[PDB]
Scaffold this active site. Structure first.
Site, short mmCIF file in Angstrom:
data_model
loop_
_atom_site.label_atom_id
_atom_site.label_comp_id
_atom_site.label_asym_id
_atom_site.label_seq_id
_atom_site.Cartn_x
_atom_site.Cartn_y
_atom_site.Cartn_z
N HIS A 5 6.35 -22.19 -29.50
CA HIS A 5 5.69 -22.08 -30.81
C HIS A 5 4.65 -21.03 -30.74
CE1 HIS A 5 2.39 -23.36 -28.31
NE2 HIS A 5 2.55 -24.65 -28.02
N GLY A 10 -5.29 -22.07 -26.58
CA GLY A 10 -4.99 -20.83 -26.01
C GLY A 10 -4.70 -21.16 -24.49
N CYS A 15 -2.01 -23.17 -23.72
CA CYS A 15 -0.43 -23.19 -23.67
C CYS A 15 0.14 -22.26 -23.07
CB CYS A 15 -0.39 -23.13 -25.21
SG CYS A 15 -0.90 -24.54 -26.09
#
Ligand SMILES: O=C(Cc1cncc2ccccc12)N(Cc1cc(F)cc(Cl)c1)c1ccc(-c2c[nH]cn2)cc1
Ligand SMILES: O=C(Cc1cncc2ccccc12)N(Cc1cc(F)cc(Cl)c1)c1ccc(-c2c[nH]cn2)cc1
EC number: 3.4.19.12
Lengths: 302, 302
Positions: free
Chosen positions: A41, A143, A145
C-alpha cells in the site's frame, strides 16, 4: 533474578531498515541482500485506501518511481514485483549489513520483537505476541508501516512480521515476509472483524512457572486437577484449550521447579475462579499470557 | 496508537559490549574510544566479596592480568586505574564503533534502557526506572554485571547505569559510569537496606495522560483538587510528593489532551481511594509509574 518483558537486541535488524517513498507516501522497508521488502500500500494515495486495485495501481508504476534511502545512501531500483501484499524491489546494491536471516510464519501464541520505525529510522523496540485472533497489541503510529517483528537464534534473524495497518478497534495487523496476512484481514481501510480474543493458556502457565522461579509462591495451592477438568474451566473463562503438547513444552520448567504441570493448572483454575484478591504476581495484578515457555527459559537461564 | 513499554534501539550500544576476564571471573565491559569500563569487583574471587580490600586486591594486578575480548578480536591492556567502583582499562585500540556518547547521572524517577549481557554478548533489551530508593527492578543473572543502561537523544548515547549486584531482596544496584553507586550501597556482599520504595507520582500522571490519549477514559471523573490536598492523599498512599515542576513537566500532555493537571490529580486521588474495581487502564490493573512524561510524548509522537 527478576523477570521482565525483554526484547531481542535490535542492532542486526537496525542495519536493514530503510526508507521507501512512492509518490507522496513514505514508509519503512527491510533491505536484505539486494532486495527491499515493504508493504504494497506504499503505492496508494489516501483516496486509494478504501478500495484499491493493487494490480492497476502498480501498473502505473516504474522502477524510477520508488525512492529507496539508507541513511543518506540511496539505492537504484532495478526490479519490482508484488508478492501477495508486499513489494519486492530489486536494488543494485546488496546490503553490506545483511545478517543471516530467515523468513518464517509464526503461530498464534508465539512472541517476537518489533522494531518500531519511522522514515526508515529506528525509534524503539518491544516484545509482543501474535494473539489467537492473529492481531497484535502493539504501539504504532502512522508511518510505522513496514516495521518488522523478528526473533534471534544465536546469529540468525527469523523475520516473522511486517506491520501493515491499525484496525479501528486500535489493534494491529500485518503479514509474514511473503505478504500473507496473519488472520482474515485485507489491506484496504474498511471495517474488519477480528475474532474473539482468547487467552494463551500455555503462556500463562509458563508465566506462573517464572513467578515461582523468582520467589512468588503465594498461589501454589493444595489441589490438583485433570487436563479435561481444567479445560472445562478454561473454556468457561475464554482460555485456549490446553493440550498434551502444551504439557510437554511446559515439561522443562515443571522439572526445574519440581511442580507438576497439572498442579500448576490447579493453581491457575483457583486463580480464574477466585481472582487474585488484590495480591500481585511478578508485579502484575493480571494473568500475563505474552511469555512463551521458551521466553521464560531464555530469561531464567541467560 | 497503542502504548507499550518500549526500549531504545540497542545497536549503538551492542557494538561497545566486550568480555572482561580477570583470573577466573568474567563479566561485561563497555569499550568506548580506547577505554574499557567495567565493575571493579571483577578483581575479586568468591571469597573476596564479603569484605574486599579493593586497593590491596588491585595492587596484586598487572595489565596482562586483564583479558579484554571483542567477539574474537582481543585488546591489549596498556593502562588500568580504579575510579570509585569501576575499572578503567586503557587499551591500545580505539573502538571503531564508538557512538557519540556522554556519561550522565540520572535522577530517581527517570528511566533508561538496559542491554542485558553475558560474556560480553548481548542477550536482551528492556526499559526500567531508577526507583526513588535508587534501586532498579530488573532482570539480571550472575554474569550480567557490567551491563549498562542508557538513553538515546538522536545520535547520542547517554550512559547512566552500570549493573553491579543483586540485593538479597532480589532488586538491583549499580553505578553511574564514573563508579558512584546510586543509593547508599557498597560493592561487598552484605545485607544492605534500601529505603522505603515510594511511587513516582509524576510518572503515574503521565501514564494516565497516555491512557486518555489511547482511548481509556473511564477514570476521568467530575472532581478537582488542590496540589496540597492531593499531596496529603499522596503521602497517605506512599506516593512521591507532587511539586510545581512536576505540573510544569506535565504541561504539554495537559495541553494535547485538554485536561488540567489538577483534574488528572483528582482522578488519581479517586483511584487511590477506591481502587480500580476490576477495571483496567491500558491493559494493566495496577497504576504504572515507570513512564516519564517524556517517555509518553516520545511514544505518542513518533
Ligand atoms: O492503518 C493504516 C496504517 C497504520 C498502521 N499502523 C498504525 C497507524 C496509526 C495511525 C494511522 C494509520 C496507521 N492505514 C489505514 C488502513 C490501511 C489498510 F491497508 C487497512 C486498514 Cl483496515 C486500514 C493506512 C495505510 C496506508 C495509508 C496510505 C497510503 N498512502 C497514503 N496513505 C493510509 C492509511
Ligand atoms: O550480586 C552479585 C552479582 C549479581 C548481580 N546481578 C544479578 C545476580 C544474580 C545472581 C547472582 C549474582 C548477581 N554479587 C554478590 C554481591 C556483590 C556485591 F558487590 C554486593 C552485593 Cl550486596 C552482593 C557478586 C558479585 C561479584 C561476584 C564475584 C566476583 N568474582 C567472583 N565472583 C560474585 C557475586
Amino acid at each position: 533474578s527478576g523477570f521482565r518483558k525483554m526484547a531481542f537486541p535490535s542492532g542486526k535488524v537496525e542495519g536493514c531498515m530503510v526508507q521507501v517513498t512512492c509518490g507522496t507516501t513514505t514508509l519503512n522497508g527491510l533491505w536484505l541482500d539486494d532486495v527491499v521488502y515493504c508493504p504494497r500500500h506504499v503505492i496508494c494515495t489516501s483516496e486509494d485506501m478504501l478500495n484499491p486495485n493493487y494490480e492497476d495501481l502498480l501498473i502505473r508504476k516504474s522502477n524510477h518511481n520508488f525512492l529507496v534511502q539508507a541513511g543518506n545512501v540511496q539505492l537504484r531500483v532495478i526490479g519490482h514485483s508484488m508478492q501477495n501484499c508486499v513489494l519486492k524491489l530489486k536494488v543494485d546494491t546488496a546490503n553490506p549489513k545483511t545478517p543471516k536471516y530467515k523468513f518464517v510464519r509464526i503461530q498464534p501464541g508465539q512472541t517476537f520483537s518489533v522494531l518500531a520505525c519511522y522514515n526508515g529510522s529506528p525509534s524503539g523496540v518491544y516484545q509482543c505476541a501474535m494473539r489467537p485472533n492473529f492481531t497484535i497489541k502493539g504501539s504504532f503510529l502512522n508511518g510505522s508501516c513496514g516495521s518488522v517483528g523478528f526473533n534471534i537464534d544465536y546469529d540468525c534473524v527469523s523475520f516473522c512480521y511486517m506491520h501493515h495497518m491499525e484496525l479501528p478497534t486500535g489493534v494491529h495487523a500485518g503479514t509474514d515476509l511473503e505478504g500473507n496476512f496473519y488472520g482474515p484481514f485485507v489491506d484496504r481501510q474498511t471495517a474488519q472483524a477480528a475474532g474473539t480474543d482468547t487467552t494463551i493458556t500455555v503462556n500463562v502457565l509458563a508465566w506462573l512457572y517464572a513467578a515461582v522461579i523468582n520467589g512468588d509462591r503465594w498461589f501454589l495451592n493444595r489441589f490438583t486437577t485433570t487436563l479435561n477438568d481444567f479445560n472445562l474451566v478454561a473454556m468457561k473463562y475464554n482460555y485456549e484449550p490446553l493440550t498434551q503438547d502444551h504439557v510437554d513444552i511446559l515439561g522443562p520448567l515443571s522439572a526445574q521447579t519440581g511442580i507438576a504441570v497439572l498442579d500448576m493448572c490447579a493453581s491457575l483454575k483457583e486463580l480464574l475462579q477466585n481472582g487474585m484478591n488484590g495480591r500481585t504476581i511478578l508485579g502484575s495484578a493480571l494473568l500475563e499470557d505474552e511469555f512463551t515457555p521458551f521466553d521464560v527459559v531464555r530469561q531464567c537461564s541467560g
